[PDB]
Write an enzyme that holds these catalytic residues in place. Structure first.
Site, PDB file in Angstrom:
ATOM      1  N   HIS A  40      17.282  11.139  57.268  1.00 36.46           N
ATOM      2  CA  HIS A  40      17.909  12.319  57.872  1.00 36.46           C
ATOM      3  C   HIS A  40      19.302  12.579  57.282  1.00 36.46           C
ATOM      4  O   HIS A  40      19.858  13.649  57.472  1.00 36.46           O
ATOM      5  CB  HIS A  40      17.916  12.278  59.429  1.00 36.46           C
ATOM      6  CG  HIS A  40      19.003  11.438  60.039  1.00 36.46           C
ATOM      7  ND1 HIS A  40      18.803  10.132  60.438  1.00 36.46           N
ATOM      8  CD2 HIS A  40      20.288  11.733  60.357  1.00 36.46           C
ATOM      9  CE1 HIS A  40      19.918   9.658  60.973  1.00 36.46           C
ATOM     10  NE2 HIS A  40      20.832  10.610  60.937  1.00 36.46           N
ATOM     11  N   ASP A  84      12.349   7.180  58.891  1.00 39.72           N
ATOM     12  CA  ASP A  84      13.717   7.562  58.592  1.00 39.72           C
ATOM     13  C   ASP A  84      14.403   6.577  57.652  1.00 39.72           C
ATOM     14  O   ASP A  84      15.370   5.905  58.019  1.00 39.72           O
ATOM     15  CB  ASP A  84      14.483   7.684  59.910  1.00 39.72           C
ATOM     16  CG  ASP A  84      15.787   8.440  59.768  1.00 39.72           C
ATOM     17  OD1 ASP A  84      15.978   9.148  58.762  1.00 39.72           O
ATOM     18  OD2 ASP A  84      16.617   8.340  60.684  1.00 39.72           O
ATOM     19  N   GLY A 174      27.506   9.168  62.864  1.00 37.54           N
ATOM     20  CA  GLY A 174      28.465   8.734  61.864  1.00 37.54           C
ATOM     21  C   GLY A 174      28.111   7.314  61.426  1.00 37.54           C
ATOM     22  O   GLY A 174      28.516   6.872  60.346  1.00 37.54           O
ATOM     23  N   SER A 176      24.922   6.485  61.503  1.00 37.05           N
ATOM     24  CA  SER A 176      23.597   6.791  60.960  1.00 37.05           C
ATOM     25  C   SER A 176      23.438   6.368  59.499  1.00 37.05           C
ATOM     26  O   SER A 176      24.335   6.591  58.680  1.00 37.05           O
ATOM     27  CB  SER A 176      23.342   8.293  61.090  1.00 37.05           C
ATOM     28  OG  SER A 176      23.774   8.739  62.358  1.00 37.05           O
ATOM     29  N   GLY A 177      22.298   5.750  59.196  1.00 35.65           N
ATOM     30  CA  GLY A 177      22.003   5.282  57.853  1.00 35.65           C
ATOM     31  C   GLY A 177      22.514   3.883  57.589  1.00 35.65           C
ATOM     32  O   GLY A 177      22.113   3.251  56.615  1.00 35.65           O
TER      33      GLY A 177
HETATM   34  N1  LIG Z   1      23.035   5.642  70.027  1.00 41.64           N
HETATM   35  C1  LIG Z   1      22.162   5.659  68.814  1.00 41.64           C
HETATM   36  C2  LIG Z   1      22.472   6.753  67.836  1.00 41.64           C
HETATM   37  C3  LIG Z   1      22.645   6.470  66.489  1.00 41.64           C
HETATM   38  C4  LIG Z   1      22.948   7.480  65.581  1.00 41.64           C
HETATM   39  C5  LIG Z   1      23.082   8.789  66.017  1.00 41.64           C
HETATM   40  C6  LIG Z   1      22.913   9.092  67.364  1.00 41.64           C
HETATM   41  C7  LIG Z   1      22.608   8.070  68.270  1.00 41.64           C
END
Ligand SMILES: NCc1ccccc1
Ligand SMILES: [Ca+2]
Length: 222
Positions: A40, A84, A174, A176-177
């Site tokens: 994503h 993902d 933020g 994420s990944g």
């Molecule tokens: N609370 C988990 C999460 C991770 C990345 C983005 C949104 C939520």
């Protein structure tokens, strides 16, 4: 990262920041030419920043390398955020040293209860925690049963939950990944969740252990 503590500088040497003007996602160095992140977070071209602690200050340990190829998993689905996971090939190999080291891919899937570390420069939802400095958090892997109970019918074979059902500690946007490391191996990729640190809503991570074949194959044909 919500409810964590500041990581000791360079204690998570595989952690990378994906930058497109500003940091937008985390990632993990798996070898000198490859980085694993969340599908994503995809962009056709990104700048990978390695050897970082404070992303707004030059520490002299950073290596900024542009990507050569960004490859989303063939079955990534934006409708449900399934599969993902994505690979980013670096245009130039990273120089491995004290500040930059790869993390090992999983030899097997970590069972429920396994303690892991998640880190990132995402939302902290706190006035004390400076998100510019790498934040760390220890979180246990939850059982599929607990994960499905929290998000009924939304958990596929490519996802696992980790964190605390009671809330207060969790990854957030933020992050994420980014990496979820347990026993020295990359077991998860920060993927999604409902809010951050809310009780009954644990983080959901991409299950790296079931992608070993795609990962190893892709890291040789490209
Ligand atoms: N609370 C988990 C999460 C991770 C990345 C983005 C949104 C939520
Ligand atoms: Ca820096």
């Amino acid at each position: 990262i919500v409810g964590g503590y500041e990581c000791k500088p360079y204690s998570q040497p595989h952690q990378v920041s994906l930058n497109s003007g500003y940091h937008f996602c985390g990632g993990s160095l798996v070898n000198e030419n490859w980085v694993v992140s969340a599908a994503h977070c995809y962009k056709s071209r990104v700048e990978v920043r390695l050897g970082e602690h404070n992303i707004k200050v030059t520490e002299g340990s950073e290596q900024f390398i542009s990507s050569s190829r960004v490859i989303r998993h063939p079955n990534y689905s934006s409708y449900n955020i399934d599969n993902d996971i994505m690979l980013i090939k670096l245009s130039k190999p990273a120089t491995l040293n004290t500040y930059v080291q790869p993390v090992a891919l999983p030899t097997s899937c970590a069972p429920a209860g396994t303690m892991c570390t998640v880190s990132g420069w995402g939302n902290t939802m706190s006035s004390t925690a400076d998100s510019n400095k790498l934040q760390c958090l220890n979180i246990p892997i939850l059982s599929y049963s607990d994960c499905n109970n929290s998000y009924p019918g939304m958990i596929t074979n490519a996802m696992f939950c980790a964190g605390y059902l009671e809330g207060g500690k969790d990854s957030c946007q933020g992050d994420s990944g980014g990496p979820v490391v347990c026993n020295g191996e990359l077991q998860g990729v920060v993927s999604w969740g409902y809010g951050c640190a809310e009780p009954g809503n644990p983080g959901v991570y991409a299950k790296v252990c079931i992608f070993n074949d795609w990962l190893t194959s892709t890291m040789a044909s490209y």
